[PDB]
Design a protein around this ligand. Structure first.
Ligand SMILES: [Mg+2]
Length: 248
């Protein structure tokens, strides 16, 4: 329903995530579309760097590695080379340590004669895409995107959750959607440990409220302090890998 605070409701219901595992095999489509990498950048020892590779609407690869700011170059190079091998764009956490990532990418693009990496910064607290669009129509007013979402992070998290929910509807209830509106997790290219961790992490952050009454994702800080839960870096990389480019 409406955005609320407290409770224990996941932004992405675990049963949606389970239903999405090999959902493209169950429903009958193969990965087709743009290739995108989400790159979450570690900020403390409590964090790890995470990458998620999606092809179209299918999560294809997940990876995790340690590294702080003083090896950022190496990390950046890693993500660059992955992007060159997979032929993918990159959306990366651009706050904190990530504020120093763009430079690195630029350098590599400047040295590359053939490959130009398309990379976009993602500021979780930034403004929502299409703020004046209608999120929900009412008898005489409309809830706008700017009325429902606290920030762009909430917007992207709910967009991915909507993908998972439609996928659950299609798998468990036989409901019909255009396949591009769904999402799938490719088990054959993801280690079972990583698949389990992905399922746990994506369903870890809870629904919350900002002080304007807009939907907000439970903060990492609140997860760590109020609930003593590790940072779901892989889930953040997944959310960033699902982001579709805007302005053209
Ligand atoms: Mg970060």
């Amino acid at each position: 329903g409406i955005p609320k605070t407290g409770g224990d409701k996941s932004v992405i219901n675990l049963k949606f995530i389970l239903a999405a595992i090999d959902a493209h095999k169950k429903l009958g489509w193969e990965p087709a579309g743009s290739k995108r990498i989400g790159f979450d950048v570690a900020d403390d020892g409590e964090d790890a760097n995470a990458t998620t590779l999606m092809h179209g609407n299918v999560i294809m690869e997940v990876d995790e590695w340690d590294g702080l700011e003083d090896e950022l170059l190496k990390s950046s190079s890693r993500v660059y080379n992955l992007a060159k091998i997979k032929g993918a764009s990159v959306t990366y956490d651009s706050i904190g340590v990530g504020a120093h990532v763009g430079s690195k990418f630029a350098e590599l693009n400047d040295a590359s004669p053939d490959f130009k990496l398309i990379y976009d910064p993602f500021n979780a607290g930034g403004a929502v895409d299409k703020p004046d669009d209608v999120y929900m129509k009412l008898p005489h007013t409309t809830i706008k995107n700017k009325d429902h979402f606290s920030n762009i992070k909430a917007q992207k998290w709910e967009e991915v959750a909507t993908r998972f929910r439609k996928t659950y509807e299609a798998v468990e209830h036989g409901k019909v959607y255009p396949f591009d509106e769904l999402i799938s997790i490719n088990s054959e290219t993801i280690h079972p440990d990583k698949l389990n961790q992905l399922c746990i992490e994506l369903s870890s952050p809870r629904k919350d409220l900002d002080m304007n009454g807009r939907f907000k994702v439970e903060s990492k800080k609140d997860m760590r302090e109020k609930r003593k839960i590790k940072s779901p870096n892989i889930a953040d990389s997944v959310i960033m890998s699902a982001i579709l480019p805007i302005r053209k």
